[PDB]
Design a protein around this nucleic acid. Structure first.
Length: 849
DNA sequence: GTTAGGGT
């Protein structure tokens, strides 16, 4: 055992701490406690009854309204704004099965509709079952909720389904996503919402009494949330007979879901696309005859295949199939050659190029923009080239979707994003390298890694359809059929790669007290070893007690729309009065960093984050500094200029700004804040005290701690608390910096690509870790008294300061318990406040002089 | 010296 720096405090300070604690310990309307205790007493049968009675609004129908809409539908179908809207609707394949779907829904609880993109199942099946209910004189009994995997799709589909009815939004169709909602009318309505929204709505209505029909869309995509939703329906549908579910899927293992619901009726509806010709790597080299020059394993795959096509393809071509680098995106100048080939032959249309990540996209842009070949220079000024990446500006602009200048061709160099999320309408030709990136968690080593991998059959199939929007197209797949033969069916259901604490905590509010039993009933059962690893985290932050039952803190954490660690972080900042910077920290780690990453400028972006980080040496405080800057730029009417100067997305920041209010309002409604404003001065008296912020940041990111040991940009010798050597990711503002006032760091995500990096970090002090962490004991090991945290880091500490810090952790642990059970804002001159001021004082001993 | 893609 080694010994860190001395953390003993001056005598005058410990004397004040003991006095303030003596005050705290001279202390002697909680509806929350009665709610918490009820949830723990009742069994499931009793839980079912109570949620019935409490959500009984749909047990009521409106006959004067029933009739009026039935009268109004028949009448408004004869206008000359409709009947043209109906006739164009009836060209869609789904509408040809309208009356059978009506019947299959009447005769069965769960049906499934499988149909390719273009079939109109999603805009039409919701309308088909509403208009039927309205005419049958049943209108006010019908409330249809249809989920989507994505926010953007939920709106434009609802704006469209509202246009197909000659209505403004919020009459008979609505949408509701997080923090933004155009709600429909209460009854006789179609509401489009993201799966997350519906899952939060279950806390109040866990047996779906507040809807008559449920449509799950894009189930084949296997989002955690649709995967989760179908398990829960197995628990709900025995207690909800009047409830009608309609699952919806592409032609991607549709049978998994039909099996899953026991052999339910299944409609197949055909699509509306142009046919897109599939070319593979052999057929590409036959048309371009490109030459490459500057484990195998590769040969096991290619020679048995080359033999089956010895007489069907050229001889010089098939020898390049032996080169390991012909497939994938290994040779950019090859991919460079195929675009130039499309630009000359093969008629007019855009080129959408699918590359794995930021690095490979950046390479080809410069090749197409700054070519080394004469054939490249010939073309460069006749192509308008768009890189398409989440961290790049192009998605939030209008150009890439629209047509190029006259005489120039559009070439889109994209990651996996343009497969589902982004849709460019003038694409004819798709170049599919077949390579993508994926995040992998190894349960055994506690390492998340980011790897390039092959894509699956479902993906290529998705990218082929991307070419059939305007006219018949072509898809060039830069891998042979022998690769496709060995590719996976679908991607790993992401629930199998994900941490599970947040679901486990949520499941406790649906009176599903056993996560091992429940998660096994999903289509793909999660690793029970990852289920246990979930509970332990939750037990550690004390959202579950040692028996594993929900605790009063844990109910608050389950009622916040954020992972419990940062949920717990936010709650501390209410009790310690630093609300605004902390909820900036939380929204950022949950959602994402508002900074773009434009091509070439990465060096300049470092300088911007360095200036925004204000030498506070923390990525989380850096974003808050950005958010305070963004607010000032609104106050100056310089917002646009501000965002163009610092590579910032105003869309993100306003959404980051919205999450903070959602955080503040919840905390206020929960009785932890006196004001729902995240900016209010009382909620923020300590928002200027940096050593306090680092201590509340650490309370949430603990126990992901790092220790740094070397100085030289600067070279770093740093290891996480488990012994593995790490670095700051080059994107984090702590990369390369020297002269840290402290050698201890907390981080949210660590990840391996070319090294094991901490993607974000805040510099923290040993005293603050000791007070908010665990694994604390006082002792002697050398001939020195020590103080440790996580039983991992041992700090020189005299006895007088230890017995105060331990006594301080006792009182802190007593305060947090009572606040979870009996939430109220901390009064300014009460007993509770003295213990707070005792911690504020001990943490300011670490202030930068 | 570097960042697949969703969402409450």
């Amino acid at each position: 055992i080694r010994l860190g720096c001395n953390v003993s405090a001056p005598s005058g300070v410990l004397e004040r701490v003991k006095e303030l604690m003596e005050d705290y310990s001279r202390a002697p309307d909680a509806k929350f406690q009665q709610q918490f205790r009820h949830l723990l007493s009742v069994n499931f049968e009793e839980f079912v009854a109570e949620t019935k009675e409490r959500n009984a609004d749909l047990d009521w129908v409106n006959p004067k309204l029933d009739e009026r809409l039935q009268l109004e539908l028949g009448q408004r179908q004869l206008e000359e704004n409709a009947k043209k809207r109906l006739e164009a609707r009836k060209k869609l394949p789904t509408m040809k099965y309208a009356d059978d779907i009506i019947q299959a829904v009447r005769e069965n609880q769960v049906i499934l509709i499988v149909g390719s993109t273009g079939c109109g199942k999603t805009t039409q099946v919701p309308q088909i079952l509403l208009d039927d209910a309205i005419s049958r004189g049943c209108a006010s009994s019908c409330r249809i909720i249809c989920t989507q995997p994505r926010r953007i799709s939920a709106i434009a589909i609802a704006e469209w389904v509202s246009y197909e009815r000659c209505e403004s939004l919020g009459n008979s169709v609505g949408y509701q996503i997080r923090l933004e909602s155009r709600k429909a009318r209460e009854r006789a309505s179609i509401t489009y919402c993201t799966t997350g929204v519906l899952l939060q709505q279950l806390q109040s209505d866990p047996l779906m009494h507040n809807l008559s029909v449920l449509i799950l869309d894009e189930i084949h995509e296997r989002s955690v949330e649709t995967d989760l939703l179908m398990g829960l329906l197995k628990v709900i549908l025995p207690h909800r007979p009047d409830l009608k579910v309609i699952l919806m899927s592409a032609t991607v293992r549709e049978q998994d879901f039909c099996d899953y619901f026991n052999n339910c009726p299944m409609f197949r509806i055909e699509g509306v696309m142009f046919p897109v010709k599939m070319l593979y790597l052999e057929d590409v080299l036959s048309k371009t005859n490109y030459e490459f020059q500057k484990r195998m394993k590769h040969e096991a795959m290619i020679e048995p295949y080359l033999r089956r096509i010895r007489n069907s393809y050229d001889s010089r071509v098939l020898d390049k199939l032996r080169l390991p680098e012909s497939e994938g995106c290994e040779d950019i100048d090859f991919i460079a050659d195929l675009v130039y080939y499309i630009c000359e032959n093969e008629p007019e249309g855009a080129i959408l190029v699918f590359l794995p990540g930021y690095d490979k996209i950046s390479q080809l842009y410069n090749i197409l923009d700054k070519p080394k070949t004469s054939k490249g220079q010939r073309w460069r000024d006749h192509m308008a080239v768009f890189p398409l990446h989440s961290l790049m500006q192009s998605g939030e602009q209008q150009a890439v979707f629209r047509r190029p200048p006259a005489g120039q061709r559009k070439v889109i160099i994209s990651t996996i994003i343009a497969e589902t999320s982004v849709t460019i309408d003038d694409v004819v030709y798709v170049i599919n390298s077949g390579r993508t990136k994926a995040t992998n968690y190894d349960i055994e080593t506690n390492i998340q890694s980011l790897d390039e991998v092959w894509v699956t059959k479902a993906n290529t199939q998705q990218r082929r359809g991307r070419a059939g929007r305007v006219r018949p197209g072509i898809c060039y797949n830069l891998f042979s059929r022998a690769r496709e033969d060995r590719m996976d069916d679908i991607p790993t259901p992401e629930i199998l790669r994900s941490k599970l604490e947040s679901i486990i905590l949520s499941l406790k509010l649906l009176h599903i007290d056993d996560p091992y039993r429940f998660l096994q009933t999903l289509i793909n059962a999660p690793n029970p070893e990852a289920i246990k690893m979930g509970v332990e985290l939750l037990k550690r932050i004390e959202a579950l007690d040692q028996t594993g039952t929900l605790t009063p803190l844990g109910m608050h954490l389950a009622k916040l729309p954020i992972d419990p660690q940062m949920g717990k972080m936010i709650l501390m900042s209410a009790l310690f009065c630093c609300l605004d910077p902390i909820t900036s920290a939380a929204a950022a780690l949950s959602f994402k960093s508002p900074f773009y990453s434009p091509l070439g400028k990465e060096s300049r972006v470092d300088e911007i984050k360095r200036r925004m980080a204000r030498n506070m040496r923390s990525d989380h405080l850096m974003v808050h500094n950005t958010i305070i800057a963004y607010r000032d730029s609104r106050y100056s009417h310089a917002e646009r200029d501000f965002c163009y100067k610092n590579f910032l997305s105003s869309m993100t920041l306003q959404q980051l700004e919205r999450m903070k209010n959602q955080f503040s309002e919840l905390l206020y409604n929960y009785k932890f804040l006196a004001s729902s404003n995240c900016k209010d001065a009382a909620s923020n008296k300590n928002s200027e005290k940096i050593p306090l912020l680092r201590a509340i940041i650490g309370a949430g990111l603990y126990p992901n701690m790092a220790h740094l040991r070397k100085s030289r940009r600067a070279i770093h010798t740093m290891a996480t608390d488990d012994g593995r050597r790490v670095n700051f990711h080059p994107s984090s503002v702590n990369s390369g910096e020297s002269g840290f006032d402290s050698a201890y760091f907390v981080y949210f995500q660590r990840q391996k690509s070319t090294d094991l990096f901490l993607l974000d970090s805040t510099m923290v002090f040993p005293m603050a870790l000791i007070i908010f962490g665990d694994g604390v004991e006082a002792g002697v090991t050398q001939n020195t008294p020590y103080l440790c945290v996580a039983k991992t880091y041992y700090f020189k500490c005299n006895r007088e300061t230890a017995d105060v810090v331990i006594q301080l952790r006792s009182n802190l642990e007593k305060l947090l318990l009572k606040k979870a059970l009996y939430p109220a804002p901390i009064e300014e001159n009460g007993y509770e406040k003295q213990l707070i001021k005792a911690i504020e004082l001990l943490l300011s001993l670490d202030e930068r002089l």
